[PDB]
Amino acid sequence: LHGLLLDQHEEQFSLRVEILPSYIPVRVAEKILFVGESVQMSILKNQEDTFAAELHRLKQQPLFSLVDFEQVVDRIRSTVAEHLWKLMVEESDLLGQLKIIKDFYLLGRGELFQAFIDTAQHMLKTPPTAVTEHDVNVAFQQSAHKVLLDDDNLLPLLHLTSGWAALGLSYKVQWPLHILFTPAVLEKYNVVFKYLLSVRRVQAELQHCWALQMQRKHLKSNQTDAIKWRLRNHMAFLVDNLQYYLQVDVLESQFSQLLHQINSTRDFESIRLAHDHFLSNLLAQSFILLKPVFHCLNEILDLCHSFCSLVSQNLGPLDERGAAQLSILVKGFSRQSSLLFKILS
Amino acid sequence: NLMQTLKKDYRLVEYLQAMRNFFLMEGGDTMYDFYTSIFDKIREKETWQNVSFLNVQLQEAVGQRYPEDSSRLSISFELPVHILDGLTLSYKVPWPVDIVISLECQKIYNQVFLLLLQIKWAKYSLDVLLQIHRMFLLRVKLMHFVNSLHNYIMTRILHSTGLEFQHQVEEAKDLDQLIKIHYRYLSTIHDRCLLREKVSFVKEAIMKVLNLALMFADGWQAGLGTWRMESIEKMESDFKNCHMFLVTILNKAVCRGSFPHLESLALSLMA
Amino acid sequence: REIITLQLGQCGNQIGFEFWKQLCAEHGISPEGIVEEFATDRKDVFFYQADDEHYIPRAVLLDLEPRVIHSILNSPYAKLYNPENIYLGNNWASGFSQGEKIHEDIFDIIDREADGSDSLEGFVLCHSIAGGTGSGLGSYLLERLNDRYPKKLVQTYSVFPNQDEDVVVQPYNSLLTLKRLTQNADCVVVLDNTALNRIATDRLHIQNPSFSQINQLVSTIMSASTTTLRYPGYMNNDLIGLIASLIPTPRLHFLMTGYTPLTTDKTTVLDVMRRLLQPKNVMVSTNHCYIAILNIIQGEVDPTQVHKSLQRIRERKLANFIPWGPASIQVALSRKSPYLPSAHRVSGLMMANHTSISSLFERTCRQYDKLRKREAFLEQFRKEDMFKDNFDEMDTSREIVQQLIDEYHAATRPDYISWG
Amino acid sequence: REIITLQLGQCGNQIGFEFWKQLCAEHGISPEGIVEEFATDRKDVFFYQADDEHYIPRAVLLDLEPRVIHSILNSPYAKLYNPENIYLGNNWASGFSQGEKIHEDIFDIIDREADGSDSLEGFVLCHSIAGGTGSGLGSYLLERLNDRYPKKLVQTYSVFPNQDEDVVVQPYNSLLTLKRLTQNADCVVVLDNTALNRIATDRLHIQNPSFSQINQLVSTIMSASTTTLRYPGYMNNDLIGLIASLIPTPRLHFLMTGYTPLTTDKTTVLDVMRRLLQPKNVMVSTNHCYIAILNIIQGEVDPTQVHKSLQRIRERKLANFIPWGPASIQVALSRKSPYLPSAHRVSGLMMANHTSISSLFERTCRQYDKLRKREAFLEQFRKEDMFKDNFDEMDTSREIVQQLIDEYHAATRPDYISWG
Numbered sequence A: 001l002h003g004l005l006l007d008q009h010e011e012q013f014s015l016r017v018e019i020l021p022s023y024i025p026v027r028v029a030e031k032i033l034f035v036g037e038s039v040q041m042s043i044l045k046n047q048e049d050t051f052a053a054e055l056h057r058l059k060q061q062p063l064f065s066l067v068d069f070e071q072v073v074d075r076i077r078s079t080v081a082e083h084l085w086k087l088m089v090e091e092s093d094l095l096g097q098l099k100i101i102k103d104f105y106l107l108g109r110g111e112l113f114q115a116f117i118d119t120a121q122h123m124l125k126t127p128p129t130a131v132t133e134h135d136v137n138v139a140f141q142q143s144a145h146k147v148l149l150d151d152d153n154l155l156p157l158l159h160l161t162s163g164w165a166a167l168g169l170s171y172k173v174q175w176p177l178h179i180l181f182t183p184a185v186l187e188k189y190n191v192v193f194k195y196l197l198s199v200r201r202v203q204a205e206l207q208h209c210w211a212l213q214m215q216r217k218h219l220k221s222n223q224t225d226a227i228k229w230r231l232r233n234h235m236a237f238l239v240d241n242l243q244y245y246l247q248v249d250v251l252e253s254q255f256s257q258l259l260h261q262i263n264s265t266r267d268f269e270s271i272r273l274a275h276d277h278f279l280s281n282l283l284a285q286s287f288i289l290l291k292p293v294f295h296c297l298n299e300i301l302d303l304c305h306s307f308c309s310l311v312s313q314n315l316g317p318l319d320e321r322g323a324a325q326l327s328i329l330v331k332g333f334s335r336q337s338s339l340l341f342k343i344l345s
Numbered sequence B: 001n002l003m004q005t006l007k008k009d010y011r012l013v014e015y016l017q018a019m020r021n022f023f024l025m026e027g028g029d030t031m032y033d034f035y036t037s038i039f040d041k042i043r044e045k046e047t048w049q050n051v052s053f054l055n056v057q058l059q060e061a062v063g064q065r066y067p068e069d070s071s072r073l074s075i076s077f078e079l080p081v082h083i084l085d086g087l088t089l090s091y092k093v094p095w096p097v098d099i100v101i102s103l104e105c106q107k108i109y110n111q112v113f114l115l116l117l118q119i120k121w122a123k124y125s126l127d128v129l130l131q132i133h134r135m136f137l138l139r140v141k142l143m144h145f146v147n148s149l150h151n152y153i154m155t156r157i158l159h160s161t162g163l164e165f166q167h168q169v170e171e172a173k174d175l176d177q178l179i180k181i182h183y184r185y186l187s188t189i190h191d192r193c194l195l196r197e198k199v200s201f202v203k204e205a206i207m208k209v210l211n212l213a214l215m216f217a218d219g220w221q222a223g224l225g226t227w228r229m230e231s232i233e234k235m236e237s238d239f240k241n242c243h244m245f246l247v248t249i250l251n252k253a254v255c256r257g258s259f260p261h262l263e264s265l266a267l268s269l270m271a
Numbered sequence C, D: 001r002e003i004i005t006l007q008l009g010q011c012g013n014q015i016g017f018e019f020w021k022q023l024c025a026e027h028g029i030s031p032e033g034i035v036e037e038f039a040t041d042r043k044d045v046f047f048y049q050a051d052d053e054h055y056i057p058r059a060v061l062l063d064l065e066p067r068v069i070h071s072i073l074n075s076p077y078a079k080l081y082n083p084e085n086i087y088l089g090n091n092w093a094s095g096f097s098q099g100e101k102i103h104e105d106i107f108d109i110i111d112r113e114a115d116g117s118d119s120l121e122g123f124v125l126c127h128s129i130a131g132g133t134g135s136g137l138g139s140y141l142l143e144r145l146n147d148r149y150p151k152k153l154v155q156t157y158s159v160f161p162n163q164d165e166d167v168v169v170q171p172y173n174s175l176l177t178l179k180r181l182t183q184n185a186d187c188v189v190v191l192d193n194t195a196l197n198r199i200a201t202d203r204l205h206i207q208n209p210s211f212s213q214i215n216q217l218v219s220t221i222m223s224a225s226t227t228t229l230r231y232p233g234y235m236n237n238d239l240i241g242l243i244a245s246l247i248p249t250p251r252l253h254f255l256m257t258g259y260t261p262l263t264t265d266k267t268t269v270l271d272v273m274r275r276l277l278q279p280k281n282v283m284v285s286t287n288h289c290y291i292a293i294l295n296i297i298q299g300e301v302d303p304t305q306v307h308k309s310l311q312r313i314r315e316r317k318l319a320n321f322i323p324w325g326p327a328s329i330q331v332a333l334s335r336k337s338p339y340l341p342s343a344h345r346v347s348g349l350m351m352a353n354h355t356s357i358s359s360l361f362e363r364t365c366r367q368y369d370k371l372r373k374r375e376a377f378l379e380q381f382r383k384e385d386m387f388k389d390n391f392d393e394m395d396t397s398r399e400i401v402q403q404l405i406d407e408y409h410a411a412t413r414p415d416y417i418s419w420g
């Protein structure tokens, strides 16, 4: 009721399971903590004595009934939890900031994370964080300036722990006003951001690698069959274009459900279950939860990166022993694509 | 009740602003009159340290109804360029307000005042004027640089900080907080301007590249062609190399140090 | 990146005038280009951001023997398009020759805008095929652009003309345009006057004023083909990323259109997809098969059903294709704009590579082959003869378009793996 | 430091009359020059301050064959300007000769004020180029002032005249004025009748009474160019400090103008700086590039954003320059005055050294070169021939202005290192 810490000496802080009396079930104990933590951060003060009269009533009765104890804890649970949701949804704009986590963190924006890779491609070398670290944040903020997208935006910061290998992002939350986003939860959002970045980067090389329609074959016959890469560009593209259409339904389906559920219920502790399921499903459904499948897909991705490399330097159509590289690549893609029939199994 | 009587009666807001405007922090038009006189080379003593003359100049430029408590009398201290330190200015503040304007703190304000008068001297030194026209080309490669410094120190650091302070002291309600906020505001003005921490690493660089502008206009007087100067290539090389040293030094800040104060002026546009 | 639209010819200038007007109301823009009190979009790609929020389209308006360019000027939207870049026969040869003398000033007007943009991505032409002045001038400008911007791409909103077959040289003019279009245009989106006229007769009673009403039909397709680019989201953000899937061979770059609510004036995704594959919703007039299909939907669309929806259409098989490609129908989704009506809360469009369009190309080649033997309309106008004494570009065009007609049918065959 | 404006000629006397009136209302001054009843601004710079109720400004008025000097006298502000210093052809030669006989009494009127004031920074000439009486008299007085005050500096609010090209000798008169202005003027601020007339047509429907309305436009620029000096501030309170960056080389001393809310009748500094760099806001009519740019803003301007704002104009690159100088665009800030309206709470002006102004000089040199060959208007008036029998000052002027035309294009080149 009052939030006082250490109401007594030993024998924020959390459950001490060894000293819990046996008859008070472990689940009734957990409910007490949530009521407690929230008080420090209500309408509890308005009706505090009414809830103290009842807790006083439970003191007068001769024998202990768990059936009665829970009902108070539970009533007090009802109002204290309703209060956090009562505010975060309206005065902390809980729903509105979520658009901000998805837009700049789950690649939900097109201009900020596409033009950024075009104007930051130079960070492909291994960095000690000496100079490139300052330059990428410099690049991100510059990226946004090209078309409006210029309000606040101070908080988003990129960090370097292979030039594009590490670019983990960090947002700064208001902690008294946000306990839903935690040090542990934003870490899991980070793992997805790095993985969803890998697909976006590779799909840019292939669409650019489609410079055959643009230049080599445009106005020039060149040589057909005698000097072609076999146009494997089309098959690599499907295994990379299809993952992008898949990623559009695993992410967009979940965000419709997390932002409609949040709307119906009225206790913050419950909403927390929705979000801890919204992120929990995004992981396994996207295949990022570590699996043999993700490892095969990452190998596919590295082979794709190397195929971009061969066509990149060739310039005017020629075979500078290009066939030897193409042969390892064409053989490799076939062997690996068959591993994608594990999904068929 | 103290704070509010210490504004209507023993005025604090007027005194604090008096310390800033038309005083050490901000020149205004009042200080333009005082500074131009001490600079003039006609009828000038070697250090022009006659205290009655300096005090007389200050009263002519009081330029207000209240023209008291300003001396410009403290003895001048007894130098790659003329680099004349001294000219110290002390303001006499009464007791019911001395509690927050300390004789200890007066020194910190005095330190910033000197830098404001050297930068004004250096810019004013390149503004009085107007191979023979090659020198006119060098007039622009130098004025841009010193003028870019005077922009950052006078407007980016001391004006913008001086607005958060003028506003924040209105809200605070205490004899000790009003001191703590004022100490915070002086520990920030003296630090963002490059006058503390590393000195041989950063301060001496601007000092010598100021010293070259000073020697450059000191070896020039208006109206002839036969300067007979073969040293224009040595000064062109000097400014260029010493400049490269300065912007690599500001660029060293990226790894460690006060990045916001520096990465703001490190963008000097280089070339 | 930013795209510059080279709208040219009276017919082409009419559909660019409307397309920009359509994005005026759809976006937050007034007739003076100023933002409005009532009005989250990537406005930049299609609109230059001026200083006082005058979002001026990067339109290049080319007038030849102007009549409808003067009417464009006396409009409330004259201020909206002010890059101040408009510069002063019914024969393909007559248009090509006129373009050659003024090529450098029209080309400097291209440069000016190119300098204004940060990165230039593509040149989108509101081209008119057999457009009198519009064709010939458009083919020549098509040839200059690729040489100057070898890295850059060119798209063509070709309004291929089919009016039941007045221009007596119409087949000759069209024949020449395609040869340039097959080797010098990275992409082309095909539309048909008769196909839309048939739609106009279907949805409405309008028959005699076919050109004025059909302009709205061409516009709805044009605004719609770009809606994934103009709005934000991780949905095919750039043009080129989208172009690759629709065009899978350097030679076959012609795209068919369709609109699920031709009568756009709730509906589940499963429904709006099936409706589109039906041939009334299509706007274009031996086994035959699509090469790859794509669809974009803008409305109140549920996300979970799309996978259920993707699978349902596959079982129905309303769309029959057996191409050398392994291409699949692809589902894409976008946001309908606020302010303008939300009627047909869910409403869609499809862009597809179909071998049927080969038949439309062969019909003009049939009229031309018949016309070539007769030599009924060689023009023999001194411009026509002096420009083309050999008359062998028409034969060069005939072999190039026949190669295209052949390539298409080769696509239908099981071995386009081998040479077309 | 007080300044004395040598306003001369009917046109020059019209813009000095208004400029002083503009600072009458803007400052705390009433029509008699007695203090305004409502009245931080320092009036000493532009107004002689005395225990006398009338704070007369340092305005010098010269009348030749007077008509509008008489209208200036029948005004409510006749008492406001009472230094009691006004002293009694359309040809440049006709004006120069008339000035020479009265030079000593007009020069004593200059002395009186110089003796009266504590210190005089400079003399400001509301000069009219090809101003009939205004030119010729103004060139001669320009030559006398530098010799008498070798240390002192002279500025010129030249209203360079462009009316689409009545004066048939206008190019000859202008040609002579510039030669004097290039070697005998420390600074010049250029304005254009056509550029302002085009602005008048743009902001308003006023076309026929162009001179009366444009006077207000020239005034807003003139009051504004001095506001950093007029109103106390941490920096730029001396004119010589303000114009130092703009003139990087003595020969190129001509300054272009612009105003962000031409229609001044909130806005962030990021936007105001950006609008100033668009060419509609400019009031002046081979690669070309600015030599150094400066801007001053007077309104409710936040000070933290200016650095982010400085850096955003750096990204937009709306201003393209590649001069031999290493000069940068510079941000300056001032206080809007109370009492008068605060409309366009934030409102700005820019003064810049631009090589484009060379083109305006060459156009009068073009008219003159064409006119010189014809010798259509040699005047051959006995004043013109007797004053100039050789007619070689025009040729001396032609080489000096051609050196200037050459020098400008030389600034654009990579080697202003070599003599320009």
Ligand SMILES: Nc1nc2c(ncn2[C@@H]2O[C@H](COP(=O)(O)OP(=O)(O)O)[C@@H](O)[C@H]2O)c(=O)[nH]1
Residues within 6 Å of the ligand: C009, C010, C011, C014, C089, C090, C128, C129, C130, C131, C132, C133, C134, C159, C161, C162, C163, C193, C211, C212, C214, C215, C218
């Ligand atoms: N879709 C559409 N096509 C048009 C329209 N007006 C003309 N056309 C087409 O333009 C072609 C002829 O171009 P034309 O108008 O003669 O160009 P001109 O030579 O400038 O008059 C024909 O094939 C028509 O189908 C229109 O309003 N809509």
Ligand SMILES: Nc1nc2c(ncn2[C@@H]2O[C@H](COP(=O)(O)OP(=O)(O)O)[C@@H](O)[C@H]2O)c(=O)[nH]1
Residues within 6 Å of the ligand: D009, D010, D011, D014, D089, D090, D128, D129, D130, D131, D132, D133, D134, D159, D161, D162, D163, D193, D211, D212, D214, D215, D218
């Ligand atoms: N800006 C401006 N220029 C004027 C005005 N009246 C005349 N002029 C200019 O004055 C020049 C001619 O000077 P003029 O009036 O003949 O001087 P006068 O010989 O004393 O009559 C022309 O170039 C005009 O552009 C005015 O009200 N405003």
